[PDB]
Amino acid sequence: ADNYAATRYPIILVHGLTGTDKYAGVLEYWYGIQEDLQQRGATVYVANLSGFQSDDGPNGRGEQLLAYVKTVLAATGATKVNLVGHSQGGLTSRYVAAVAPDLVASVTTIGTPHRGSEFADFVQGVLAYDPTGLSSTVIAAFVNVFGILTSSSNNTNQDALAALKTLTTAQAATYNQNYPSAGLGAPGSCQTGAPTETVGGNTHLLYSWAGTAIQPTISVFGVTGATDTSTIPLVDPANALDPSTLALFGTGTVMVNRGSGQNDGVVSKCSALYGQVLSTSYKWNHLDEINQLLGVRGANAEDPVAVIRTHANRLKLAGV
C-alpha cells in the first residue's frame, strides 16, 4: 500500500461485450486489476452492465451505467468519477460523459471501436446471407441465453443482435453523429481530436491506447497474411496456455483482409484513436489489454496491469 494510484475521484471500470457480468460469474473481467489498484490506494468500482445490448436507448448499457455512476457517487460521497472502459465499454463511457458531463472528470478508452469493427461487419454480412433469415433468430436465442446465464446478476436484458449492430462500422458513424466529442477527429481521417473537452463549465480529460499485436505482412493472390507480434514465433507458450491468443490472430487475419490494417484482433488502430492517444504500439491482442485469459500474454507483450496502474497515477498528477 501507498497512494500511488489514489485519485481524487473514484475510478469506475467499464466492460465491453460478453455476459451481463461486471466480473465474476465465472472469472473476473478485469483480471487482477482491481486488487492491484486498491493495493496502491485507489477507490475502484467495477460496473456490471448487460453483456449484449446497444449503448444508447432506454434499455441500453448507457442508461445502466448512468444509474450506476449515481449509485457510486451517493455511496462514496464523491462528486465526479473517472471512467475507464475497454472495448464497447469506451462507447458506454462516452454516453455518460455526453449525457451527464457534470458527473465525469475523465474518460479513458482502451481498445475501443469508436469507428466500429470490420470484424463486426463481417459477422453481420454472414448472418444476412441466409435467404430464409432463420439463422439470425436462432443464434440470437443462443447468445441471449448465454448472456443471462453468464451474467452475475443473471440479467435478462440481453439483445445479441443490437450489440452486433452497434459494433458495426456504419452504425458507429451514426453513433458519433448523435454523441459527438471533441476527442474525435474527422471520420475517415485515422486521426485523433483534442485532449480535453469542455462541456460548459465542466472540463473532461480524454485518453486512449490501442493494442496492435496483429500486423499485416504480405499480400499474394489477393489475400494478405498477418503476424502476431505479441508472441515469439511458433514456440510461445501463450499459444498453448491461452486459447484466445490464436483465436484473435485468426479474427485479426479476417480484419486485415477487410482493409483494417494493424489491429488487436477486433479493433483497428484507426478506430481506437481518441483524445490524447498515449500509445498504439502495445503488442497486445484485444484480451491482453485487460490481462486475459488469467493473466497469460505473449513474450513480447507489455504488462497491462503496470500500464493501467501508471495511468491511475497520471490522473492523480493531473488533478482528477
Q: Active-site residues: which are they?
A: 87, 264, 286
Query: Is 102 one of the annotated binding-site residues?
Result: no
Question: Closest distance between Ca ion and the C-beta of residue 248, in Å?
Answer: 8
The Cα-based distances of 196 to 73, 148, 156, 184, 193 in angstroms read 23, 37, 37, 10, 9
124 annotated to a ligand binding site? no
Which positions from 296 through 315 interact with Ca ion, judged by CB under 5 A? Answer: 296-297
Per-residue b or e along 191-220, where b marks 16 or more CB atoms closer than 10 Å to that residue's CB: ebbeeebeeeeeebbbbbbbbbbbbbeeee
- According to the annotation, is 158 in a ligand binding site? no
Options 88-96, 180-188, 284-292, 304-312: segment touching Ca ion (CB under 5 A)? 284-292
Distance CA 144, CA 72 (A): 28
Q: Does 242 bind Ca ion (CB under 5 A)?
A: yes
How far apart are CB 19 and Ca ion at their closest, in Å?
A: 18
Shortest CB 15 distance to Ca ion, Å: 16
Residue (185 or 237) nearer to Ca ion, CB:
237
Q: How far apart are CA 238 and CA 245, in angstroms?
A: 7
Site for Ca ion in 118-147 (CB under 5 A): none
Are 205 and 83 contacting, i.e. CB atoms less than 8 angstroms apart?
A: no
With a CB cutoff of 8 Å and minimum separation 6, the contacts of 135 are: 127
Q: Is 236 in the site for Ca ion (CB under 5 A)?
A: no
Closest CA to 262 of 228, 295, 290: 228
Nearer to Ca ion, 96 or 248 (CB): 248
Stretch that binds Ca ion, among 21-29, 59-67, 178-186, 282-290 (CB under 5 A): 282-290
Q: Is 13 annotated as a binding residue?
A: no
276 is in an annotated binding site: no
User: For residues 56 and 242, which CB has a smaller minimum distance to Ca ion in the complex?
Assistant: 242
Stretch that binds Ca ion, among 130-138, 217-225, 274-282, 294-302 (CB under 5 A): 294-302
Q: Does 289 bind Ca ion (CB under 5 A)?
A: no
Per-residue CA distances from 296 to 117, 289, 299 (Å): 24, 11, 10
Burial of 175 (0-12, 13-18, 19+ CB in 10 A): buried
Determine the angle formed by the axes of helices 118-128 and 134-150, rounding to 10 degrees: 130
SS3 180: coil
64 is in an annotated binding site: no
**Nearest distance from C-beta of residue 300 to Ca ion, angstroms:** 12
Residues that bind Ca ion (CB under 5 A): 242, 288, 296-297
* Binding-site residues from annotation for Ca(2+): 242, 288, 292, 296
* Binding-site residues from annotation for substrate: 17, 88
* Binding-site residues from annotation: 17, 88, 242, 288, 292, 296
